[PDB]
Design a protein around this ligand. Structure first.
Ligand SMILES: [Mg+2]
Ligand SMILES: [Mg+2]
Ligand SMILES: [Mg+2]
Ligand SMILES: [Mg+2]
Ligand SMILES: [Mg+2]
Ligand SMILES: [Mg+2]
Ligand SMILES: [Mg+2]
Ligand SMILES: [Mg+2]
Ligand SMILES: [Mg+2]
Ligand SMILES: [Mg+2]
Ligand SMILES: [Mg+2]
Ligand SMILES: [Mg+2]
Ligand SMILES: [Mg+2]
Ligand SMILES: [Mg+2]
Ligand SMILES: [Mg+2]
Ligand SMILES: [Mg+2]
Ligand SMILES: [Mg+2]
Ligand SMILES: [Mg+2]
Ligand SMILES: [Mg+2]
Ligand SMILES: [Mg+2]
Ligand SMILES: [Mg+2]
Ligand SMILES: [Mg+2]
Ligand SMILES: [Mg+2]
Ligand SMILES: [Mg+2]
Ligand SMILES: [Mg+2]
Ligand SMILES: [Mg+2]
Ligand SMILES: [Mg+2]
Ligand SMILES: [Mg+2]
Ligand SMILES: [Mg+2]
Ligand SMILES: [Mg+2]
Ligand SMILES: [Mg+2]
Ligand SMILES: [Mg+2]
Ligand SMILES: [Mg+2]
Ligand SMILES: [Mg+2]
Ligand SMILES: [Mg+2]
Ligand SMILES: [Mg+2]
Ligand SMILES: [Mg+2]
Ligand SMILES: [Mg+2]
Ligand SMILES: [Mg+2]
Ligand SMILES: [Mg+2]
Ligand SMILES: [Zn+2]
Lengths: 82, 155, 126, 60, 208, 99
RNA sequence: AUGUGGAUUAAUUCGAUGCAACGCGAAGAACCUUACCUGGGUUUGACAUGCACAGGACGCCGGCAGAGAUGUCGGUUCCCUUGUGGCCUGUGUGCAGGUGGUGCAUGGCUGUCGUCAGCUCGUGUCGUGAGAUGUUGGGUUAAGUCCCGCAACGAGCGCAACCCUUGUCUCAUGUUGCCAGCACGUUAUGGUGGGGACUCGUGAGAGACUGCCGGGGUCAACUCGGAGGAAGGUGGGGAUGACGUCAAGUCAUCAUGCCCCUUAUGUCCAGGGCUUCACACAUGCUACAAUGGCCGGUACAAAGGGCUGCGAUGCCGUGAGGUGGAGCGAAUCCUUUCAAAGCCGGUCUCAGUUCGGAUCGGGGUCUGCAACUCGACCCCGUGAAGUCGGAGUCGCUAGUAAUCGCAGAUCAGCAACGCU
């Protein structure tokens, strides 16, 4: 877990994009190329398209998953069993 | 051992009492190479046996070793595609060493909940003739006298 | 002044002999206090016991390096050699007893690829 | 070692974390000793040739 | 592995370091520059055999001493190759660089240059048979040298196989540390690939 | 009372002994008191390398890096002696630190 | 906890496959290393050089757009001197560039037979010929080490020696090291004035050569015993791989012949991977409880590391650690007075246990721009399997086997129980 003194880490470009989105009140799907971006309460009603290496998979964020990284909810490996 | 009989180490004598049998016992019971621990445990168990029996610890140990030391053993041999056993006489020195070995073996595997007292009690049982060591000696002699027939091989 | 030095498995010792009483001075404390082991006391007193001049020499000991047994053996050798120096007339009995022969064994070099000393890694043909 | 990768490593990285040895001549990123600046085989060969003033076999 | 190089084995007794200098902080940069300049000189000069290259460093000043078969092309009558080498070193930033040329006494009494000659003869057109015969005869003719052993490994004659053949005469006591062995190694080029030649020379004994 | 710690630190025993001998002779000729090359423990650096790449690592060997250091405490640092020590030219195998 | 097999995945980069691969090439995989997969740029090109047509620019420090490369703009601009050198921006020309292939083409390096003692050549002689003698038999040794007669006479690589360490003594030698004998400390210890009388650390020499005696021996090798001596019959351990075999490993160290891409299989960056598992194998630690778990007191060593690094005393934290920072390029200052086992005192009376600790949750510290896949450390809750083990199988003959510790290599952070 990230230290509290350093605080949460958010990429500048994605922060700018989400700030513009929430300031203009428009809600759309944003192509997200960042896996190290932590979730912030401001993302309560924003949709992000995370890249798993194959195709940008949209994900809908709600207040429930606060405190968790974006890549946690985007599976990277496909395991169909045996 | 191909070249010939190797030299034998000059085993030291016990200064506490004066019998090298104590040194042999402590060396045999050495576990994980803790000399001080082994010797202190042996001395404590010897004192326990002394206070339990009311006699001389050295004398009772001599009685136990005399009672339990065998004189004939059994050796395995296979000839003509069949396995057989032959009885061969044993030197008293090796007999005493193996008697100590069996003493340790049967002082390892009983359920008295405390081995310090239990080794003393095992010594008392062996001296009295009710010990697992004397039972093993009985079995060994029985096997040897049963296989006496195949003694013609002489090996 | 009489001086002697004993070494065994990196156990250098110093002894100074004094015809006074049989007092044992090991770094400012008595033999019973320093390394309280019966085997130790026995081996340290073995030379004086053999020569039969007990309670006649006082020894002050300075110890550096080595272990307990190493220091005890080095001290035994040192007092034996000092006794011979002050009176070589006991040479033939002491050499027969083996008190004046040093112990030429110590920690030996250990191989690269071996765990330690002479150890050998598990050697399986599978 | 690829010459392009060697040149890129020699270039100044945008982050201090991206600094690594890349043994000078043979460009082996692994099995390199810092003070020598050379990898295991480089050290073996140079020492055997005797090109470094002070290294020598071991027998003690 | 079969044999360890006699040079490395006997470093501590008979042969001396061919480079002497002390440094610990700038030791990395110094070794880098020495190994560099050595490689650059090796790849630059090929026509004239160079036996050994020794470098001594004293603070800023550095002195390089060169042994070669013949100085005619190593240093020009006006200093052609000398000035090219100086310019090279100056580009490499050797600070104050001083050049000296030392000439060997017996051309074929040492391993390096005989190896160069054998490699050249093998490469151009000469057969390995005659190459070994002539090399051994020439090495023998010198009285001081006693034992010579030459080995050639690789593809010989263009055949699709590897031939490992060695010819021996005289002393080759590599186990005896007191003996004096000279070791050389060079690679001979050809159309079909690369060939390596190794030669051992024994020169008397040393006591002291 | 002033003393100068002339540090002699080299690799080769022959080189360090020769440098020490030259220093002793220079000091004796200049007329200054020197204790001499007091022996010091020699730092030992051992490095282990494998035989060849691509496994075959069971058999190894070690390389040492011999470093011999000697202590030279010179008493009465005469100006002539210090100047002579400055002007003395020593082989590259020996580096002298004055502190 | 590592490595592989087998199955998935777009990829889990490649090679090695009984002896002689399987804590391997990985002495430190979140970017780099990666060469794998998606996507976005790119072009005689990320990076060198010679020939023609265009020139004094190139080279650089910053704002703006972008997943990043990169595109556009703000500030400087040649050092020589008339021929151009240096450097490179646009066109190409050759050509760079490839961890793409080929260890059944190779150089070099390396493992095993094996630290086994065997393996050869000159002359001669014999037979026709492929060939034989020397290298046969007896004795002896760790050894083709040696003696005896023999068509053999000699020599070579090997064996021992010469090299390192360890076992002793003598001489030289006193600081940052020690204290015999004298003075100052007075709780802090040679700490301080002084001193080689021994170690202490590094220079020289001596000492093991069957040296001598008695018996066996062909009077010879060689062997048993005995005296002196530290060592007695190569004292101990090391450096040290004869010709060759295994088409043994290594084009993924490097270089190397040939084929292949060049507008790509080259090149820069954003995210993911090499740590995936319904199983198997190999190597290690923890054990499976009393020779013990736990608590308090308590004494004994070696060696090495330390500059953009060790880190004193003091203060706050249970502890990770936070502030601070003396002494150090280092017998001096730190790695605690280098300890663990060891000795004394107390509880547990044999339990799935006060042994034993993995898995799963709740709180923090440290290095890093970047700890979810994916690091390590501290605190708490959680309490699973496991009672000496099946046929089979492995190491070990003196400081040996067993048991308990310390430092270093790669390293800002560690996969550290592996290696030295
Ligand atoms: Mg194996
Ligand atoms: Mg790096
Ligand atoms: Mg590397
Ligand atoms: Mg030899
Ligand atoms: Mg493991
Ligand atoms: Mg693979
Ligand atoms: Mg395996
Ligand atoms: Mg396998
Ligand atoms: Mg391994
Ligand atoms: Mg990759
Ligand atoms: Mg990867
Ligand atoms: Mg390939
Ligand atoms: Mg292959
Ligand atoms: Mg064979
Ligand atoms: Mg004929
Ligand atoms: Mg024959
Ligand atoms: Mg024959
Ligand atoms: Mg013969
Ligand atoms: Mg033969
Ligand atoms: Mg031979
Ligand atoms: Mg003193
Ligand atoms: Mg061979
Ligand atoms: Mg092959
Ligand atoms: Mg093959
Ligand atoms: Mg190629
Ligand atoms: Mg090629
Ligand atoms: Mg191609
Ligand atoms: Mg390509
Ligand atoms: Mg990239
Ligand atoms: Mg992996
Ligand atoms: Mg463990
Ligand atoms: Mg605190
Ligand atoms: Mg302590
Ligand atoms: Mg637990
Ligand atoms: Mg637990
Ligand atoms: Mg525990
Ligand atoms: Mg169980
Ligand atoms: Mg149980
Ligand atoms: Mg079985
Ligand atoms: Mg690390
Ligand atoms: Zn390298």
């Amino acid at each position: 877990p990230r230290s509290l003194k350093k605080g949460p880490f958010v990429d500048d470009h994605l922060l700018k994009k989400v700030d513009v989105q929430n300031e203009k009140n428009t809600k759309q799907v944003i192509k997200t190329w960042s896996r190290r971006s932590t979730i912030i309460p401001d993302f309560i009603g924003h949709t992000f398209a995370v890249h798993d290496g194959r195709k940008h998979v949209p994900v809908f964020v709600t207040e429930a998953m606060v405190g968790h990284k974006l890549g946690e909810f985007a599976p990277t490996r496909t395991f169909k069993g045996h | 051992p191909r070249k010939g009989p190797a030299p034998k180490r000059p085993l030291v004598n016990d200064p506490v009492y004066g019998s090298q049998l104590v040194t042999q016992l402590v060396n045999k019971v050495l576990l994980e190479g803790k000399k001080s621990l082994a010797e202190r445990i042996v001395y404590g168990a010897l004192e326990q046996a002394r206070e339990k029996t009311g006699t001389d610890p050295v004398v009772t140990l001599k009685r136990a070793l005399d009672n339990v030391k065998p004189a004939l053993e059994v050796r395995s041999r296979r000839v003509g595609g069949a396995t057989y056993q032959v009885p061969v006489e044993v030197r008293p020195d090796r007999s005493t060493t193996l008697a100590l070995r069996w003493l340790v073996n049967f002082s390892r595997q009983r359920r008295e909940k405390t081995m310090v007292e239990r080794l003393a009690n095992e010594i008392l049982d062996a001296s009295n003739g009710l010990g697992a060591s004397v039972k093993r000696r009985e079995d060994t002699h029985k096997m040897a006298e049963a296989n006496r027939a195949f003694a013609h091989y002489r090996w | 002044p009489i001086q002697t030095v004993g070494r065994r498995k990196e156990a250098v010792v110093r002894v100074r002999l004094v015809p006074g009483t049989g007092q044992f001075n090991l770094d400012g404390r008595t033999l019973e206090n320093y390394f309280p082991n019966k085997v130790h006391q026995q081996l340290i007193k073995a030379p004086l016991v053999t020569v039969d001049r007990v309670d006649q020499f006082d020894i002050y000991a300075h110890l550096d390096g080595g272990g307990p047994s190493g220091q005890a053996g080095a001290l035994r050798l040192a007092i034996a050699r000092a006794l011979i120096l002050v009176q070589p007339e006991d040479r033939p009995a002491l050499k027969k007893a083996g008190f004046l022969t040093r112990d030429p064994r110590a920690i030996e070099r250990k191989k690269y690829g071996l765990k330690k000393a002479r150890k050998a890694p598990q050697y399986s043909k599978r | 070692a690829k010459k392009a990768l060697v040149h890129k490593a020699n270039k100044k990285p945008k982050f201090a974390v991206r600094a690594y040895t890349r043994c000078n001549k043979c460009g082996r990123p692994h099995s390199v000793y810092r003070k020598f600046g050379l990898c295991r085989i480089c050290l073996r060969e140079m020492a055997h040739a005797g090109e470094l003033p002070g290294v020598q076999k071991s027998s003690w | 592995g079969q044999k360890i190089n006699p040079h490395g084995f006997r470093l501590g007794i008979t042969t001396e370091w061919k480079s002497r200098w002390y440094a610990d902080k700038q030791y990395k940069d110094y070794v880098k520059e020495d190994v560099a300049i050595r490689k650059l000189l090796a790849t630059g000069l090929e026509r004239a055999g160079i036996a050994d290259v020794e470098i001594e460093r004293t603070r800023d000043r550095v002195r390089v001493d060169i042994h070669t078969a013949r100085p005619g092309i190593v240093i020009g009558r006006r200093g052609t190759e000398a000035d090219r080498i100086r310019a090279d070193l100056e580009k490499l930033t050797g600070k104050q660089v001083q050049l000296n040329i030392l000439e060997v006494k017996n051309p074929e009494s040492q391993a390096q240059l005989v190896a160069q000659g054998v490699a050249e003869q093998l490469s151009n057109r000469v057969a390995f048979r005659r190459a070994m015969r002539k090399a051994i005869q020439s090495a023998m003719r010198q009285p001081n040298v006693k034992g010579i052993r030459v080995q050639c490994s690789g593809r010989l004659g263009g055949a699709e196989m590897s031939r490992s053949e060695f010819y021996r005469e005289g002393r080759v006591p590599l186990h005896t540390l007191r003996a004096d062995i000279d070791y050389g190694l060079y690679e001979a080029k050809t159309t079909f690939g690369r060939i390596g030649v190794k030669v051992w020379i024994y020169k008397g004994d040393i006591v002291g | 009372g002033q003393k100068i710690r002339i540090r002699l630190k080299a690799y080769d025993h022959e080189a360090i002994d020769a440098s020490a001998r030259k220093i002793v002779e220079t000091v004796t000729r200049t007329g200054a008191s020197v204790v001499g090359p007091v022996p010091l423990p020699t730092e030992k650096n051992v490095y282990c390398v494998i035989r060849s790449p691509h496994k075959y690592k069971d058999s190894r060997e070690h390389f040492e890096m011999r470093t011999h250091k000697r202590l030279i405490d010179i008493l009465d640092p005469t100006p002539k002696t210090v100047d002579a020590l400055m002007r003395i030219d020593l082989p590259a195998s020996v580096d002298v630190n004055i502190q």
